[PDB]
Design an enzyme around this catalytic site. Structure first.
Site, PDB file in Angstrom:
ATOM      1  N   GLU A  41      40.199  41.163  37.140  1.00 11.96           N
ATOM      2  CA  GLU A  41      41.359  41.697  37.839  1.00 11.96           C
ATOM      3  C   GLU A  41      42.324  40.589  38.229  1.00 11.96           C
ATOM      4  O   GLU A  41      43.535  40.821  38.300  1.00 11.96           O
ATOM      5  CB  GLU A  41      40.917  42.466  39.084  1.00 11.96           C
ATOM      6  CG  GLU A  41      42.021  43.285  39.733  1.00 11.96           C
ATOM      7  CD  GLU A  41      41.685  43.707  41.146  1.00 11.96           C
ATOM      8  OE1 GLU A  41      40.608  44.298  41.353  1.00 11.96           O
ATOM      9  OE2 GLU A  41      42.499  43.439  42.055  1.00 11.96           O
ATOM     10  N   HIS A  42      41.811  39.388  38.493  1.00  4.97           N
ATOM     11  CA  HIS A  42      42.711  38.313  38.901  1.00  4.97           C
ATOM     12  C   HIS A  42      43.651  37.876  37.779  1.00  4.97           C
ATOM     13  O   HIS A  42      44.794  37.495  38.056  1.00  4.97           O
ATOM     14  CB  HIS A  42      41.919  37.117  39.419  1.00  4.97           C
ATOM     15  CG  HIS A  42      41.625  37.186  40.884  1.00  4.97           C
ATOM     16  ND1 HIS A  42      40.771  38.119  41.426  1.00  4.97           N
ATOM     17  CD2 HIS A  42      42.086  36.450  41.923  1.00  4.97           C
ATOM     18  CE1 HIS A  42      40.709  37.949  42.734  1.00  4.97           C
ATOM     19  NE2 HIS A  42      41.499  36.943  43.061  1.00  4.97           N
ATOM     20  N   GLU A  93      39.813  31.248  48.119  1.00  6.74           N
ATOM     21  CA  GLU A  93      39.921  32.521  48.816  1.00  6.74           C
ATOM     22  C   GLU A  93      38.607  32.923  49.472  1.00  6.74           C
ATOM     23  O   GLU A  93      38.613  33.723  50.414  1.00  6.74           O
ATOM     24  CB  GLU A  93      40.384  33.545  47.782  1.00  6.74           C
ATOM     25  CG  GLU A  93      40.648  34.974  48.199  1.00  6.74           C
ATOM     26  CD  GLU A  93      41.609  35.658  47.241  1.00  6.74           C
ATOM     27  OE1 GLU A  93      41.220  35.890  46.075  1.00  6.74           O
ATOM     28  OE2 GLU A  93      42.755  35.944  47.641  1.00  6.74           O
TER      29      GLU A  93
END
Ligand SMILES: CCCCCCCCCCCCCCCCCC(=O)OC[C@H](COP(=O)([O-])OCC(O)COP(=O)([O-])OC[C@@H](COC(=O)CCCCCCCCCCCCCCCCC)OC(=O)CCCCCCCCCCCCCCCCC)OC(=O)CCCCCCCCCCCCCCCCC
Ligand SMILES: CCCCCCCCCCCCCCCCCC(=O)OC[C@H](COP(=O)([O-])OCC(O)COP(=O)([O-])OC[C@@H](COC(=O)CCCCCCCCCCCCCCCCC)OC(=O)CCCCCCCCCCCCCCCCC)OC(=O)CCCCCCCCCCCCCCCCC
Ligand SMILES: CCCCCCCCCCCCCCCCCC(=O)OC[C@H](COP(=O)([O-])OCC[N+](C)(C)C)OC(=O)CCCCCCCCCCCCCCCCC
Ligand SMILES: CCCCCCCC/C=C/CCCCCCCC(=O)OC[C@H](COP(=O)(O)OCCN)OC(=O)CCCCCCC/C=C/CCCCCCCC
Ligand code: HEM
Ligand code: HEM
Ligand SMILES: O=C1C(=C2CCC(c3ccc(Cl)cc3)CC2)C(O)=C(O)c2ccccc21
Lengths: 45, 55, 104, 423, 32, 56, 54
Positions: free
Chosen positions: D60-61, D137
């Site tokens: 998804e990134h 993150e």
């Protein structure tokens, strides 16, 4: 009182009737078993 | 309660044991009585709240 | 009709017999503080609250001293103020409304 | 003038079709100058093993970072020059990519949407950049306490089963995942009969179907070697996880039992129950979380540290009340709250598109609001009593707590709160 | 952050009445 | 699936506290008599010939 | 703090009959409880003595 006459209270009492007569059975049979109450116990096979 | 066919010697000792023990139950219940009292405090002759003039 | 004057007559008699006027007290001062009465007392404005508190302390002091006010200073039946009644009526209405909701 | 239920008949139908490769196309046309179009995919974290837990989030990134036909930022520039928006998400059980646009742009939209799901350019440089970003993150405490306690709940409830594992996965894995893993993941899971193409707004169904055949019809469908991974069957455990930290301002708490899943009817009645329940503390909620064969049914709250016990007492008491003593008057209110929620949610194209996709994955079919209304109308206090008893009464719960949680009751004390001695 | 969470295994302590899995979950619960 | 004995026992009797209590009183009624009779039999048997009940 | 308030037994005594707030205006009718307690104590003592000869 006069407050507790109305629909919700009727519904609420109906909700608890069965539990009430079950506890009644418990108390009655226990009393009889505890006092060897022949009036009831002579009918138990 | 008689311990027999009639009032007699077995009943007097029962009277005496009970008369011996009851006063102390009375004492304990008196303490409970006052415990309950001190949660609110004393009423007074006028029947109105006295929290402005407590000593 | 005359019946009004007659009933008011007996009512004044009962008021003088009660004798809280001898202590400088109003009728609404003498209520027992149940739940509704306490809530009505909560709603009072400051001036009425303070007047009530002092009047009550003064009656208690007199009762301590087994004394009463001079007759000139007794509360008179024809010029009394029922200062708490309005608030109490509202409190009771609110409770009645809630009860009536609770049975449906 | 109409009735509510009669207004529910005017809502338009959802058309559905199939391609030859088994991809299904679904649409609802609403005559507007704006539209939402997406692809929903029947894949999520509960299909990953501990060897590649976290692959979907990685993918998804770098989904929107380039395709062969559109290297690098060319795709981004073409999306932004139309004035359109592009978004994605990933769940314990689903994945989705959609676009918001003007109805005029449907041919390009679908084109781009097909270019993204078949032709992402998994370049080593971009993979390493995403690796660094995800590690950064994860390094700092960038998680909200709510998310923490819900992750803890899934871990304790579904321990030893794939559903216990998180969407992001462990950090040890992101520093160790390779391009081979990513491409194997895609080849094994991204197959046509697991995909839905959904559209809402000013879209005509046959045009969408033509574009789907043109741009999505070459996606394969032959599952090979049954290469799909073998995994553990479902189980729910009554258990607790406690993480104590007396420096945090407030205590967070979550408690569930096991729910029935998407397919069962009972869900409706349960929702009504929820609406009846939802002062002591700052914040409180009830929830139902559904999966294919199981779920979580429970509540979440935040308290000052000296008021955890009372709050637990209140909550469990309301549960017992509903199981034993419900009445008609409150049930009616709950049904009305549920009606309002259902109709409020479906406002605008995006939520509607999303509902189409999720529905075709979970139910096999779009359920119209009229059917939901008919299902709601049948509930009554007796049904609530019965079903609450069927899922809540005398059951072992799953508990999670985070914060200053000294006053959180012992597990035996919590278990004993799930039944009444006077019943 | 938290995402690294995992409950350690309890295999030694759990009952055989759930390990012999040929019966729906809630019926098992009832037996126990 | 498998209607097993303890599960029927839970669902019929033990799930509700009143019925649990009733089950208990009913069990004690019959346990008392069975247990007394067994004990008296054993006792009588240990020392036959020495009790005045039979010498009578 | 004073010792009056240093300790549970002492603080209960204090809340009972040292710093208890009482109405200023109660009359003689409120003396009869303490007299009741006195009477109970008298009875217990005289009874324990009699007991040893009855
Ligand atoms: C001696 C040696 C000493 C040294 C030993 C050394 C070793 C010791 C080690 C062990 C130490 C243990 C310490 C204690 C631990 C306590 C734990 C605890 O409290 O947990 C709290 C526990 C945790 O829950 P929680 O988090 O607090 O949540 C609260 C919720 O409300 C939860 O809600 P819920 O619905 O789940 O539960 C509520 C309900 C749950 O209970 C029930 O609903 C029923 C439970 C089973 C049935 C019991 C019925 C008893 C009825 C009275 C007796 C009559 C029986 C019938 C015969 C009739 C004869 C005319 O219980 C109650 O409401 C409490 C009262 C229940 C009985 C009702 C009667 C009250 C009056 C009692 C006096 C009566 C006197 C006159 C009798 C008639 C004339 C002779 O919750 C409780 O409330 C537990 C209740 C425990 C009740 C015990 C009752 C015992 C007394 C029975 C009667 C005795 C007199 C008999 C006279 C003769 C006639 C038969
Ligand atoms: C051989 C044996 C020898 C034995 C010797 C015994 C010697 C005993 C000496 C005792 C000395 C006590 C001193 C205490 C000082 C305490 C100071 C204090 O703070 O007091 C506050 C206390 C009052 O407290 P409070 O804060 O005001 O609250 C009370 C009320 O709430 C206030 O409410 P209120 O303000 O509305 O009330 C106003 C009014 C309320 O007035 C009314 O209600 C109206 C009354 C009208 C009466 C009218 C006359 C009678 C009725 C006639 C009606 C017409 C009949 C027509 C018939 C027609 C037929 C055809 O009430 C009064 O003012 C009452 C004052 C008088 C109290 C009398 C107490 C008597 C105690 C007797 C003890 C007996 C046992 C002794 C031992 C025996 C051993 C064998 O008392 C006083 O203020 C008075 C202190 C002075 C009392 C002196 C008593 C002397 C008794 C001597 C008895 C000797 C004979 C024994 C015969 C035994 C036969 C077996
Ligand atoms: C006045 C004299 C005559 C009185 C006679 C009394 C008659 C009634 C007797 C009833 C006995 C059985 C009651 C059981 C109630 C259980 C409730 C409960 O919480 O159970 C679950 C609890 C907790 O169980 P649990 O926590 O494992 O799980 C319970 C959960 N459910 C209910 C869902 C299954 O169990 C107990 O710990 C209960 C212990 C009860 C001990 C009673 C001892 C006997 C005392 C009475 C008999 C002796 C009388 C002597 C008279 C002599 C006269 C001369
Ligand atoms: C041999 C023949 C008999 C001889 C008898 C001699 C003793 C006679 C009677 C004496 C009574 C006691 C008087 C002195 C008491 C002093 C108490 C004291 O100092 O404590 C006060 C102080 C008050 O507390 P606070 O309020 O916190 O103070 C803070 C102030 N800002 O401390 C206390 O709390 C009280 C402590 C009390 C201690 C009492 C000690 C009593 C000793 C008695 C001995 C008797 C011996 C008898 C012997 C008989 C023959 C074998
Ligand atoms: C051994 C028997 C009793 C003892 C030792 C006892 C003791 C006391 C004491 C010391 C007080 C303190 C206030 C006072 O003295 O008035 C008191 C108050 C009180 N007693 Fe008792 N008492 C006894 C019996 C009773 C009885 C039989 C009743 C009622 C039927 C009763 C009701 C009350 C009440 C209502 C108060 C407080 C009333 C108030 O403060 O206005 N007591 N008691
Ligand atoms: C509230 C407390 C008490 C009350 C109201 C009470 C009351 C009485 C009464 C009325 C009598 C008979 C009096 C007579 O016959 O002339 C009596 C006798 C007796 N009491 Fe008490 N009593 C109390 C406490 C006690 C206690 C604690 C004892 C402890 C042993 C006790 C021991 C006796 C004895 C031995 C007798 C018989 C002696 C006699 O009759 O003189 N009493 N009691
Ligand atoms: O006398 C008391 C009283 C108490 C004083 C101490 C007494 C007492 C009795 C025996 C012993 Cl060994 C010690 C103290 C018991 C009654 C008490 O608690 C009150 O609250 C109260 C209120 C108003 C008027 C009087 C009283």
């Amino acid at each position: 009182m006069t407050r507790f006459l109305g629909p919700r209270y009727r519904q609420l009492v109906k909700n608890w009737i069965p539990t009430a007569y079950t506890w009644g059975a418990v108390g009655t049979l226990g009393l009889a078993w505890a006092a060897d109450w022949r009036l009831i116990l002579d009918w138990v096979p | 309660i008689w311990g027999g066919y009639s009032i007699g010697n077995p009943t007097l000792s029962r009277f005496f044991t009970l008369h011996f023990i009851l006063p102390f139950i009375i004492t304990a219940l008196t303490m409970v009585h006052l415990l309950f009292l001190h949660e609110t405090g004393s009423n007074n002759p006028c029947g109105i709240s006295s929290d402005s003039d407590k000593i | 009709s005359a019946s009004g004057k007659w009933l008011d007559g007996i009512r004044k008699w009962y008021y003088n017999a009660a004798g809280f006027n001898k202590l400088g007290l109003l009728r609404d001062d003498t209520m027992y503080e149940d739940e509704d009465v306490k809530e009505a007392i909560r709603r009072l404005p400051d001036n009425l609250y303070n007047d009530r508190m002092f009047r009550i302390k003064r009656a208690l002091d007199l009762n301590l001293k087994h004394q009463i006010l001079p007759k000139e200073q007794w509360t008179k039946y024809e010029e009394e103020n029922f200062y708490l009644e309005p608030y109490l009526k509202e409190v009771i209405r609110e409770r009645k409304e809630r009860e009536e909701w609770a049975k449906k | 003038t109409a009735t509510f239920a009669q207004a529910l008949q005017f809502v338009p139908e959802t058309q559905v079709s199939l391609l030859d490769n088994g991809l299904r196309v679904a649409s609802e046309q609403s005559s507007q100058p704006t539209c939402t179009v997406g692809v929903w995919i029947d894949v999520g974290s509960r299909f990953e093993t501990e060897k590649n837990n976290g692959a979907g989030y990685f993918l998804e990134h770098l989904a929107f970072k380039g395709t062969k036909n559109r290297p690098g930022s060319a795709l981004e520039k073409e999306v932004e020059s139309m004035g359109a928006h592009l978004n994605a998400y990933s769940t314990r059980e689903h994945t989705a990519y959609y676009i918001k646009a003007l109805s005029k742009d449907l041919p390009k939209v679908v084109e781009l949407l097909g270019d993204i799901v078949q032709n992402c350019s998994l370049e080593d440089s971009q993979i390493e950049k995403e690796r660094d970003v995800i590690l950064r993150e994860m390094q700092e405490n960038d998680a909200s306490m709510r998310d923490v306690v819900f992750d803890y709940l899934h871990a304790t409830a579904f321990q030893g089963t794939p559903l216990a594992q998180t969407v992001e996965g462990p950090s040890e894995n992101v520093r160790k995942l390779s391009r081979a893993d990513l491409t194997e993941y895609l080849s094994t899971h991204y197959k046509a009969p697991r995909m839905v193409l959904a559209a809402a707004g000013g879209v005509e169904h046959q045009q969408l179907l033509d574009l789907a055949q043109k741009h999505l019809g070459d996606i394969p469908w032959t599952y090979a070697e049954d290469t799909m991974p073998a995994l553990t069957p479902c189980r729910f455990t009554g258990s607790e996880i406690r993480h104590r930290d007396d420096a945090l301002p407030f205590a967070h708490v979550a408690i569930a039992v096991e729910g029935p899943g998407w397919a069962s009817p009972d869900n409706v009645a349960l929702q009504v129950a929820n609406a009846i329940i939802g002062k002591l503390c700052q914040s409180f909620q009830t929830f139902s979380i559904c999966y294919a064969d199981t779920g979580l049914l429970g509540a979440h709250f935040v308290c000052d540290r000296m008021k955890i016990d009372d709050m637990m007492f209140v909550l469990q008491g309301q549960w017992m009340r509903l199981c034993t003593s419900a009445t008609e008057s409150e049930v009616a209110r709950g049904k009305n709250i549920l009606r309002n929620a259902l109709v409020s949610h479906l406002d605008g194209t995006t939520p509607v598109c999303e509902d189409i996709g999720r529905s075709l994955l979970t139910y096999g079919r779009r359920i119209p609001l009229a059917e939901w209304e008919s299902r709601i109308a049948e509930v009554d206090a007796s049904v609530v009593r019965e079903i609450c008893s069927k899922y809540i009464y005398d059951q072992c719960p799953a508990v999670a707590g985070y914060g200053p949680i000294e006053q959180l009751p012992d597990y035996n004390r919590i278990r004993s709160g799930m039944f009444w001695l006077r019943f | 952050s938290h995402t690294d969470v995992k409950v350690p295994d309890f295999y030694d302590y759990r009952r055989l009445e759930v390990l012999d899995s040929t019966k729906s979950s809630r019926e098992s619960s009832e037996a126990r | 699936a498998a209607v097993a004995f303890t599960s029927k026992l839970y669902s019929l009797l033990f799930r509700r506290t009143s019925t649990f209590a009733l089950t208990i009183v009913v069990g004690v009624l019959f346990f008392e008599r069975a247990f007394d009779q067994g004990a008296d039999a054993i006792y009588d048997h240990i020392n036959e010939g020495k009790l005045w009940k039979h010498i009578k | 703090t004073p010792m009056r308030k240093s300790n549970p037994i002492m603080k209960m005594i204090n809340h009972s009959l040292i710093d208890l707030p009482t109405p200023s205006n109660i009359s003689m009718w409120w003396n009869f409880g303490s007299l009741l307690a006195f009477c109970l104590i008298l009875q217990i003592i005289t009874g324990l003595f009699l007991a040893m000869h009855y």
